[PDB]
């Protein structure tokens, strides 16, 4: 899986986001943030295997 790890100025990993748990988590890993303004954002595509 793909993770989005946050680094502190002290140099140690502090938080993280799992980019496959929720639709919201995918949105966070796409705009590279932890808080997002209201709106509609387009994300990766989907296929029916």
């Amino acid at each position: 899986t793909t993770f989005m790890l946050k680094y502190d100025e002290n140099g140690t990993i502090t938080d993280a986001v799992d980019c496959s748990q929720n639709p919201l988590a995918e949105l966070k890993c796409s705009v590279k943030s932890f808080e997002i303004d209201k709106g509609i954002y387009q994300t990766s595509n989907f296929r029916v295997v």
Partner: protein
């Protein structure tokens, strides 16, 4: 077809002719109230049939397979794709977030989808012998 792709085929089992469609693909967009007022989101599957993409989520046949996700019987057809996570309403508003052809979504009181409100319904008393003249300004 006109694009020089493979539009049809004839079975080699001594039978009739069939068609071929490109399965079902598209895009997804996530509507968010802003992360300062909620954590729930709605998803739009662009240019698909809700029936087709509702059973696909049941048999686990979507490449963007979210682990913790479900569809609470809130599927809406619209025309710009299939909308999941927002409940339809019949009270027009000022289109907080735009979607497709005259459809918009807003938070209000969970995410709710409605139809655009162009403006205020007003009427003018047209007569052939009456005039209106302002008496004050600002």
């Amino acid at each position: 077809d006109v694009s020089d792709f493979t539009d049809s085929v004839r079975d080699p089992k001594t039978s009739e002719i069939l068609d071929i469609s490109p399965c079902s693909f598209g895009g997804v967009s996530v509507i968010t109230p802003g992360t300062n007022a909620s954590s729930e989101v709605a998803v739009l599957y662009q240019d698909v049939n809700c029936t087709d993409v509702s059973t696909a989520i049941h048999a686990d046949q979507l490449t963007p397979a979210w682990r913790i996700y479900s569809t609470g019987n809130n599927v809406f057809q619209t025309q710009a794709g299939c909308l999941i996570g927002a409940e339809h309403v019949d009270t027009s508003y000022e289109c907080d977030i735009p979607i497709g052809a005259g459809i918009c979504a807003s938070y209000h009181t969970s995410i709710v989808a409605y139809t655009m409100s162009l403006g205020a319904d007003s009427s003018i008393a047209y007569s052939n012998n009456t005039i209106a003249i302002p008496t004050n300004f600002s």
